[PDB]
Amino acid sequence: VLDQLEVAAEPTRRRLVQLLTSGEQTVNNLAAHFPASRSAISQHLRVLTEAGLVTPRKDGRFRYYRLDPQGLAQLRALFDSFWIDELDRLVADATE
Amino acid sequence: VLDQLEVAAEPTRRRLVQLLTSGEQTVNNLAAHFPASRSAISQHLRVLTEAGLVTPRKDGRFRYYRLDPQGLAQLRALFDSFWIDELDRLVADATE
Numbered sequence: 467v468l469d470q471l472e473v474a475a476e477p478t479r480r481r482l483v484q485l486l487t488s489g490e491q492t493v494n495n496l497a498a499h500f501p502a503s504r505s506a507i508s509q510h511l512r513v514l515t516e517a518g519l520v521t522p523r524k525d526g527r528f529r530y531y532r533l534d535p536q537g538l539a540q541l542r543a544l545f546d547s548f549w550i551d552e553l554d555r556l557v558a559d560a561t562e
Numbered sequence: 563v564l565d566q567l568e569v570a571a572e573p574t575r576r577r578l579v580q581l582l583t584s585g586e587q588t589v590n591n592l593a594a595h596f597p598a599s600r601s602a603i604s605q606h607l608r609v610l611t612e613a614g615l616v617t618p619r620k621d622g623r624f625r626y627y628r629l630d631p632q633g634l635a636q637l638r639a640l641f642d643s644f645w646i647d648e649l650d651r652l653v654a655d656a657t658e
């Protein structure tokens with residue numbers, strides 16, 4: 467089945483999730499933040515919907531998407547179980 | 563170019579990164595933790611290498627991989643910039 471963290475981590479999908487934090491929005495309005503087409507953004511939103519991260523609603527000529535807390539909680543759980551302590555310890559070893 | 567968070571988030575790659583926290587390991591030894599073939603695991607390790615998350619070394623008949631802190635620091639930075647406050651607030655709205 468779809469893993470929420472794998473799906474969400476795609477960089478356009480990350481940005482779509484951030485954009486939706488300001489509330490439910492139309493496909494066309496979200497799509498205006500990217501060089502990619504409406505159709506491209508629509509397909510990313512369908513993938514996020516299948517993963518349980520966003521939820522669609524239709525009202526007339528607009529399709530709206532909003533974040534689903536249920537999916538976000540599973541996303542955060544997957545990242546928390548992935549990111550074990552030694553990974554934080556290694557990050558602290560990094561130079562720049 | 564490769565985004566470390568997108569690459570790392572693939573579920574086999576997440577587990578390979580966790581496994582490597584116990585130290586540098588051979589391809590065959592890592593591969594023994596999964597139903598997938600050596601060849602499959604080898605290819606995931608090549609992707610992680612290209613993303614700067616792991617580093618290869620050859621000694622005789624073994625190829626060894628180890629975590630690269632430089633890549634892990636960028637991975638953690640990408641997740642931290644993605645996961646904005648409102649996402650934590652929404653996770654707290656989730657039921658179960």
Ligand SMILES: [Mg+2]
Pocket residue numbers: 532533534535
């Ligand atoms: Mg809601």
Ligand SMILES: [Mg+2]
Pocket residue numbers: 628629630631
């Ligand atoms: Mg090292």
